[PDB]
Amino acid sequence: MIGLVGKKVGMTRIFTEDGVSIPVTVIEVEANRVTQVKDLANDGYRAIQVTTGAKKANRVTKPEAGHFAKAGVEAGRGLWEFRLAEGEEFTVGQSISVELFADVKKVDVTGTSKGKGFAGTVKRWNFRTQDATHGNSLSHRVPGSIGQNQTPGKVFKGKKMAGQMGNERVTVQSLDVVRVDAERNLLLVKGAVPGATGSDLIVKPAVKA
Amino acid sequence: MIQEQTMLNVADNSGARRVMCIKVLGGSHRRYAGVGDIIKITIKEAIPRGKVKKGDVLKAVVVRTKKGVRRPDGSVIRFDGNACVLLNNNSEQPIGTRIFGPVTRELRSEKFMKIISLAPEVL
Amino acid sequence: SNIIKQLEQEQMKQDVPSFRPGDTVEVKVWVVEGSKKRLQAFEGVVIAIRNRGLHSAFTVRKISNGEGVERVFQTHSPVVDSISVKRRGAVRKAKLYYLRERTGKAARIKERLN
Amino acid sequence: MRHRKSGRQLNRNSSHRQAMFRNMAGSLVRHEIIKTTLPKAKELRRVVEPLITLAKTDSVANRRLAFARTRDNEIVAKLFNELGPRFASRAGGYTRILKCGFRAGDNAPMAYIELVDR
Amino acid sequence: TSKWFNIDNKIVDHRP
Amino acid sequence: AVQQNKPTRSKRGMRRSHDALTAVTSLSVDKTSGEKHLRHHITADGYYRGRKVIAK
RNA sequence: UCGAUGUCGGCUCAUCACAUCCUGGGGCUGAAGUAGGUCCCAAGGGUAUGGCUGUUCGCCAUUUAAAGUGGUACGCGAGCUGGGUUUAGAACGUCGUGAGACAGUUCGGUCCCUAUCUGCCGUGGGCGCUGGAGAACUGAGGGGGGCUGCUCCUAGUACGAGAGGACCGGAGUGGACGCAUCACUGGUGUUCGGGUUGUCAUGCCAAUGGCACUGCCCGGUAGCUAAAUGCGGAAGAGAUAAGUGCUGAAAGCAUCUAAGCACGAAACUUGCCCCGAGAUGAGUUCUCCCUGACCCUUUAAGGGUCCUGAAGGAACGUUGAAGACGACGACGUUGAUAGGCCGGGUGUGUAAGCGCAGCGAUGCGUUGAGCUAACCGGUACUAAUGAACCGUGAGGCUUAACCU
RNA sequence: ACCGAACCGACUAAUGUUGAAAAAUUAGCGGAUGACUUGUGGCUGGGGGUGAAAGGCCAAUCAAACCGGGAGAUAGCUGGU
Ligand SMILES: N[C@@H](Cc1c[nH]c2ccccc12)C(=O)O
Ligand SMILES: [Mg+2]
Ligand SMILES: [Mg+2]
Ligand SMILES: [Mg+2]
Ligand SMILES: [Mg+2]
Ligand SMILES: [Mg+2]
Ligand SMILES: [Mg+2]
Ligand SMILES: [Mg+2]
Ligand SMILES: [Mg+2]
Ligand SMILES: [Mg+2]
Ligand SMILES: [Mg+2]
Ligand SMILES: [Mg+2]
Ligand SMILES: [Mg+2]
Ligand SMILES: [Mg+2]
Ligand SMILES: [Mg+2]
Ligand SMILES: [Mg+2]
Ligand SMILES: [Mg+2]
Ligand SMILES: [Mg+2]
Ligand SMILES: [Mg+2]
Ligand SMILES: [Mg+2]
Ligand SMILES: [Mg+2]
Ligand SMILES: [Mg+2]
Ligand SMILES: [Mg+2]
Ligand SMILES: [Mg+2]
Ligand SMILES: [Mg+2]
Ligand SMILES: [Mg+2]
Ligand SMILES: [Mg+2]
Ligand SMILES: [Mg+2]
Ligand SMILES: [Mg+2]
Ligand SMILES: [Mg+2]
Ligand SMILES: [Mg+2]
Ligand SMILES: [Mg+2]
Ligand SMILES: [Mg+2]
Ligand SMILES: [Mg+2]
Ligand SMILES: [Mg+2]
Ligand SMILES: [Mg+2]
Ligand SMILES: [Mg+2]
Ligand SMILES: [Mg+2]
Ligand SMILES: [Mg+2]
Ligand SMILES: [Mg+2]
Ligand SMILES: [Mg+2]
Ligand SMILES: [Mg+2]
Ligand SMILES: [Mg+2]
Ligand SMILES: [Mg+2]
Ligand SMILES: [Mg+2]
């Protein structure tokens, strides 16, 4: 089944009447507008393309404005694509809301996880530090050894080293759907989702099950 | 959060006063043992006429921790000590006949119903 | 934001009494054992109060059978059935964390008479 | 990582930063235009403007609060006697930064920071 | 003159 | 550590391939004085967006 | 190799083999069940903490499903150490007349390097992709992940004289590991509030500020974070290994194989997550933009002058949960991008001034007061200036199909 | 004799090691009325001095200083021709 594009708003708790407090993430999922529908004949695969929110009229460039006017919908802040299964079909210019997610139990939430910048090996790969004392000299959080001697005489690919950590596409799977709230455009899922507050997320029905 | 080499008080009347957690049973590379958890102990102090002597190695159940338990609404119950109840190596029922101090509902299982029955206060 | 405040505000309680640290307070909480649901009372001195709206909590301390117990209650939780202050305490601090290190006659708290 | 943190460290420790921002606030109030490096000008906004608001609301306690932040009775007097009623109808933004190039000595972005009614 | 790690004895006599 | 072989003028030029400065794209004319200046900078005489901001 | 290839052990990071320690599949059993013995397949993941000792090894204590055997300069000192063995001191035992000597012992004893190249981890610039440009994709390929305990039901059933006690299947709940996050419990919070010692200063009292590790301490917002709390490992499919077969001759019988057919594992190909058209084999879809004139010549994918400057981009500025720098994201007056301001929230804890009680330190009233950083909702007060700059003028040849 | 600054020294750790320094810095450390420490001057000379003894010190050099000389020692050895 297709998904919907929302934005992470923040986290809250939900107290329920047997007195347990469910940590929930609130995702504002307002009406996504289907812009382009792709098919096996013209494009070679079946997908829909949706847009959401609004964007400044002076900053929607002419190709984007032409595309949105061809679909006949107001310009949004981006374009995303969802692959279609066989039993389901959509039309161009069509609004989708959270009432689609009214009857799902678990979702997969995809978002761009926060950037930690250039991070070290201890933060990035759970490496162990060496001794802070006992003679240790300028080698407390260093990576250690990165190879073997003459054979092979090289560092193997995929060696866990320091570098850019975070700011990258991350999926959290099989999160419970605590509440679907159609009139306020809210999806409350149980647990944390990737990314910062006020940020784009793609929520799909769960693929594992 | 009790680990190896940790000194714990005895919350029963077996005859020991202090014990030392020397192993956290029930898993490989297991680090900590929370409230309601079986550990292996050795006895470091003893009452002169107790049921156990200094230097015995036997089991114990951690029943109070300063780290405390968390309750499903988000609550936390903390104590001002680490306290355990001694158990036989094989039977894993308590040695003493009375338990001092409060214990927690996290021990409410069939394995520790004797402790729950004899406790003065169950929080 | 506005959405989160709206969700919290429709969840919050409407009748939490006004208490300050140093107060002796009785908190009656729900306890479920077997299938029976009953009220257990925890009486002690509030040593900490964290106000965050729905996420507000308060730390109470008692001496129970010779052992000092701290409980942190969530103020708006359904399990915290009732809060009632019995004695107003006169302190000059917002967090009374020295009452852990103090015991007996040293942990006495003056009464606030206004 | 400095996610959602404010202020500039400005290659100085905390006491040095506090001392020079007190000095720059005193100089800016005395002269009504000063030429300084651009990040120092932005931080000088963040230091100076609450002092002009405190000057808008006149009281003995407000004068004592300004003497504790500016440590200068002349600056406090000029604030509460002139820049209070001069900016009494303006809601914030009492200053202005105009970029004016790079220092000859070390290639810096200089900027004039001035009060708006000068 | 000479480097201290060449005058040293623990690292010069490294493979006796 | 230190080189085993001498790098060439070819590799010296290849490393310095990225060292080239970029000139300013275009200067500005002021609508009162008419003087070229850097954008969002006050001019040499003391004008900015057509107002004499600094004396002299 | 002596115009030098640094040695045992520990730490840090590993990677490969399979002669498999666990988990997985099976044959035989002197296999009743439980538990085993032995052999065959199988390298996906997993594969102890402490005492002694310089130790690897070993012994011992207690765990675990298990505590695998090996290669890698007995992996790893331009990554750490320096306990051991290796200089110079000194002593013991023994040997020597002696200087001295002991894989005998004991106490003490300098471990350098700013990385050019290859490699690896990240992140950009240029050009290409055949008119220019803005997006969204397809997926050749590449990587990550792949562990498992215990309890309960089936069932005290099958099996067994009893003791004991299942296969197959299902439910729950843990350990280790990994990703994400900050709502909770916490840590930090030298940018907020207060207590206080010494001293100096603001003319002095009162009130404040500087300096003493933030002077010492007590709390603590936002952010970052773990000990906190969400999720994960799969199911399924395809082709199989050992193994089990069906039909069936060669060999009238028999036979799993020769023809034909079916099962069969954590290994293999997918399924799950991520990168991914420099995939030069440079792909697809949608949209947007440019429809002037003239002159020379080695007359062709030629050069030159005037007019023209689009879509878009860059630059500049305000900046950001983005960031070493580039880069990426938001905004630029038709504006909430930042700062300020207003209101709130949070934190601290009842400011200063004045009055009252007291001889006085001090207490009480005004008073949950004052102040309050990064937070929340707002607001054009200040700053984001009109422009200028790069990018063009319909886009080659040949051959097929369509319209005409 | 004891505790502790000046002053004398140099036990441990980190930094530095093409250093700030051809032996130091920082934080701790030992002596501190004595077999103490220090300023000016003098004396002892190289198979010699001096040594509360380490083959230690004698001008950043010590199992025999430095300087000039025999001297272009010698080199069955290495490099070059
Ligand atoms: N490396 C140290 C000690 C040292 C000096 N000279 C030496 C000669 C040989 C060995 C060590 C040293 C230094 O530079 O100060
Ligand atoms: Mg960041
Ligand atoms: Mg470690
Ligand atoms: Mg060193
Ligand atoms: Mg900010
Ligand atoms: Mg600097
Ligand atoms: Mg200071
Ligand atoms: Mg060579
Ligand atoms: Mg060589
Ligand atoms: Mg095999
Ligand atoms: Mg597989
Ligand atoms: Mg061992
Ligand atoms: Mg080796
Ligand atoms: Mg090895
Ligand atoms: Mg080594
Ligand atoms: Mg090496
Ligand atoms: Mg040694
Ligand atoms: Mg010797
Ligand atoms: Mg003798
Ligand atoms: Mg020897
Ligand atoms: Mg080194
Ligand atoms: Mg892989
Ligand atoms: Mg928060
Ligand atoms: Mg806290
Ligand atoms: Mg603090
Ligand atoms: Mg403060
Ligand atoms: Mg005074
Ligand atoms: Mg001073
Ligand atoms: Mg399978
Ligand atoms: Mg046959
Ligand atoms: Mg393989
Ligand atoms: Mg603003
Ligand atoms: Mg408050
Ligand atoms: Mg005060
Ligand atoms: Mg003496
Ligand atoms: Mg000496
Ligand atoms: Mg020494
Ligand atoms: Mg010293
Ligand atoms: Mg002495
Ligand atoms: Mg002394
Ligand atoms: Mg000798
Ligand atoms: Mg000398
Ligand atoms: Mg001689
Ligand atoms: Mg001669
Ligand atoms: Mg000669």
Side-chain angles (χ1 to χ4, degrees):
Chain A
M1 183 145 68
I2 68 157
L4 282 72
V5 184
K7 56 194 317 293
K8 183 176 180 194
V9 180
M11 294 178 71
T12 305
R13 55 200 321 162
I14 297 290
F15 283 112
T16 186
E17 321 86 340
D18 62 358
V20 299
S21 75
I22 300 170
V24 294
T25 308
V26 181
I27 306 163
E28 176 188 31
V29 182
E30 65 183 1
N32 305 308
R33 275 150 289 141
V34 175
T35 295
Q36 180 175 15
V37 171
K38 303 178 153 184
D39 45 358
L40 294 174
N42 196 357
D43 288 31
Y45 70 104
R46 305 193 62 237
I48 59 164
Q49 189 189 84
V50 305
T51 189
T52 184
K55 196 203 251 173
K56 286 194 173 279
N58 57 2
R59 270 194 190 272
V60 173
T61 63
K62 275 223 170 184
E64 315 190 358
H67 185 75
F68 281 125
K70 202 251 202 182
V73 294
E74 291 293 327
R77 66 163 183 271
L79 294 174
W80 298 265
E81 266 195 30
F82 292 94
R83 287 281 214 106
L84 286 165
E86 189 63 33
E88 65 183 1
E89 293 83 3
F90 291 87
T91 60
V92 161
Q94 172 173 344
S95 179
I96 310 172
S97 73
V98 188
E99 189 176 2
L100 183 63
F101 274 10
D103 263 348
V104 300
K105 294 304 188 213
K106 293 178 182 295
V107 290
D108 290 330
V109 186
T110 291
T112 311
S113 61
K114 292 181 181 179
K116 314 305 176 77
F118 196 104
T121 61
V122 172
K123 194 190 173 61
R124 199 169 186 237
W125 299 117
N126 287 260
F127 275 20
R128 294 183 249 192
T129 69
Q130 301 163 48
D131 291 331
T133 75
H134 292 293
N136 196 292
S137 67
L138 321 178
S139 296
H140 304 295
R141 300 170 68 99
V142 291
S145 187
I146 65 176
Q148 301 83 33
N149 194 328
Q150 214 184 106
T151 294
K154 73 179 181 176
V155 181
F156 290 131
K157 277 216 175 60
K159 188 77 193 76
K160 290 166 186 185
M161 302 174 135
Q164 163 74 32
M165 166 178 215
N167 197 34
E168 61 185 343
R169 174 158 189 249
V170 167
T171 302
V172 174
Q173 272 174 327
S174 178
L175 299 168
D176 302 345
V177 176
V178 173
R179 179 179 296 166
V180 165
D181 204 343
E183 69 275 16
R184 304 140 91 91
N185 303 347
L186 291 191
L187 189 60
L188 275 78
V189 304
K190 171 174 174 196
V193 304
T197 290
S199 72
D200 273 328
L201 303 169
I202 295 91
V203 193
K204 301 199 216 183
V207 66
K208 281 282 190 76
Chain B
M1 181 165 308
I2 307 299
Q3 54 187 35
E4 321 206 0
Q5 303 254 340
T6 294
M7 285 263 187
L8 286 83
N9 300 317
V10 164
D12 72 39
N13 68 352
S14 58
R17 294 201 81 51
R18 315 202 51 81
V19 301
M20 181 171 88
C21 173
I22 67 176
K23 187 70 64 188
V24 181
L25 311 176
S28 179
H29 295 119
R30 182 167 198 186
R31 284 191 263 285
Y32 314 122
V35 165
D37 288 320
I38 309 288
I39 57 182
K40 198 87 179 190
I41 59 160
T42 180
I43 298 171
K44 303 308 227 205
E45 301 216 0
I47 298 314
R49 260 156 285 288
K51 314 172 181 73
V52 290
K53 284 192 101 53
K54 184 177 76 174
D56 285 344
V57 181
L58 73 168
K59 291 181 162 103
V61 64
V62 194
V63 305
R64 295 198 277 279
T65 58
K66 289 174 71 69
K67 194 73 189 302
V69 297
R70 302 214 44 192
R71 294 311 191 61
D73 52 88
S75 299
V76 59
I77 307 177
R78 283 189 297 250
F79 299 97
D80 291 331
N82 306 295
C84 64
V85 166
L86 314 194
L87 315 171
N88 306 56
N89 269 300
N90 297 115
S91 171
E92 291 196 0
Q93 283 69 60
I95 302 176
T97 61
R98 294 191 40 270
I99 293 90
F100 314 124
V103 304
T104 304
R105 324 211 81 71
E106 319 301 302
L107 280 74
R108 261 202 159 270
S109 67
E110 183 65 27
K111 186 176 180 180
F112 306 133
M113 281 305 327
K114 292 181 181 179
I115 300 168
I116 301 299
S117 66
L118 307 169
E121 200 166 282
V122 179
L123 272 76
Chain C
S1 46
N2 271 355
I3 296 95
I4 305 297
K5 294 262 151 73
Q6 203 144 20
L7 268 288
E8 279 165 27
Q9 191 65 34
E10 66 183 1
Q11 301 198 67
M12 311 215 308
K13 284 176 169 172
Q14 292 316 307
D15 55 298
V16 296
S18 179
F19 54 93
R20 292 175 33 168
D23 288 352
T24 307
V25 64
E26 176 176 358
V27 184
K28 280 184 175 290
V29 298
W30 290 109
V31 54
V32 177
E33 54 189 1
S35 85
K36 274 292 151 283
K37 184 133 61 63
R38 66 179 177 90
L39 285 87
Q40 191 176 58
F42 193 92
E43 183 178 1
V45 172
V46 286
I47 73 165
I49 295 181
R50 163 216 169 82
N51 293 302
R52 297 285 189 297
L54 176 67
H55 316 298
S56 66
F58 62 106
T59 300
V60 187
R61 172 176 178 87
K62 75 181 289 185
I63 285 284
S64 197
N65 315 95
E67 181 46 30
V69 190
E70 294 201 14
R71 285 212 47 151
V72 179
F73 298 95
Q74 312 294 309
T75 310
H76 301 282
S77 164
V79 71
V80 180
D81 170 81
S82 179
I83 307 161
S84 66
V85 54
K86 293 182 183 293
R87 174 161 170 310
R88 283 152 321 201
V91 299
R92 287 195 57 182
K93 278 206 185 298
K95 312 287 197 282
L96 307 174
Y97 289 141
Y98 51 87
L99 296 181
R100 299 168 168 152
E101 287 79 43
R102 273 156 155 80
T103 310
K105 285 276 202 188
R108 295 194 282 196
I109 293 168
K110 294 262 161 163
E111 189 156 1
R112 183 162 43 60
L113 294 174
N114 52 5
Chain D
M1 273 175 283
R2 51 148 296 277
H3 295 170
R4 312 277 276 185
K5 298 194 190 204
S6 66
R8 286 157 180 74
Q9 208 194 299
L10 289 176
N11 295 36
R12 295 159 167 80
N13 69 93
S14 60
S15 65
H16 191 179
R17 268 198 315 282
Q18 187 191 241
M20 66 178 288
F21 289 138
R22 186 175 300 173
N23 285 359
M24 281 200 319
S27 297
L28 174 61
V29 167
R30 251 209 298 288
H31 296 289
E32 280 181 336
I33 190 166
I34 62 170
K35 204 222 291 183
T36 183
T37 64
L38 182 69
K40 268 181 223 173
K42 317 268 195 62
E43 294 297 322
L44 190 55
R45 286 186 309 177
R46 265 167 56 82
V47 176
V48 162
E49 299 196 15
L51 273 168
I52 293 178
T53 298
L54 198 61
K56 290 181 181 178
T57 308
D58 180 77
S59 178
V60 173
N62 282 356
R63 291 210 185 213
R64 285 182 171 182
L65 271 182
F67 185 55
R69 294 162 150 86
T70 65
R71 285 308 291 184
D72 213 318
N73 270 308
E74 183 178 1
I75 305 297
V76 168
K78 165 162 179 163
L79 276 157
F80 279 90
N81 292 329
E82 305 194 11
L83 301 179
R86 252 163 64 182
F87 297 132
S89 64
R90 197 183 279 281
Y94 317 119
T95 57
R96 181 177 291 118
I97 293 146
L98 314 173
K99 286 164 275 287
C100 62
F102 312 93
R103 197 143 56 179
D106 55 16
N107 203 44
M110 300 265 157
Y112 287 102
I113 173 166
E114 73 156 358
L115 304 186
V116 288
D117 62 358
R118 185 196 63 103
Chain E
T1 59
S2 182
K3 301 287 99 175
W4 77 268
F5 42 92
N6 300 334
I7 307 297
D8 194 6
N9 189 282
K10 165 72 87 166
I11 47 181
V12 159
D13 291 331
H14 65 89
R15 182 171 54 240
Chain F
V2 65
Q3 63 189 41
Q4 282 215 339
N5 282 132
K6 185 193 174 178
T8 74
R9 54 182 72 78
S10 168
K11 303 306 304 313
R12 183 183 68 219
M14 292 180 183
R15 182 180 52 245
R16 297 178 179 167
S17 170
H18 301 275
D19 274 15
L21 306 178
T22 48
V24 288
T25 61
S26 66
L27 275 70
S28 289
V29 309
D30 195 5
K31 65 179 181 178
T32 300
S33 160
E35 293 172 347
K36 294 182 183 293
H37 62 109
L38 269 172
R39 196 156 186 77
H40 305 101
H41 286 255
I42 70 180
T43 76
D45 180 271
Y47 277 89
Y48 183 50
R49 281 168 89 177
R51 182 173 67 87
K52 174 83 91 203
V53 288
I54 192 66
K56 289 159 309 188

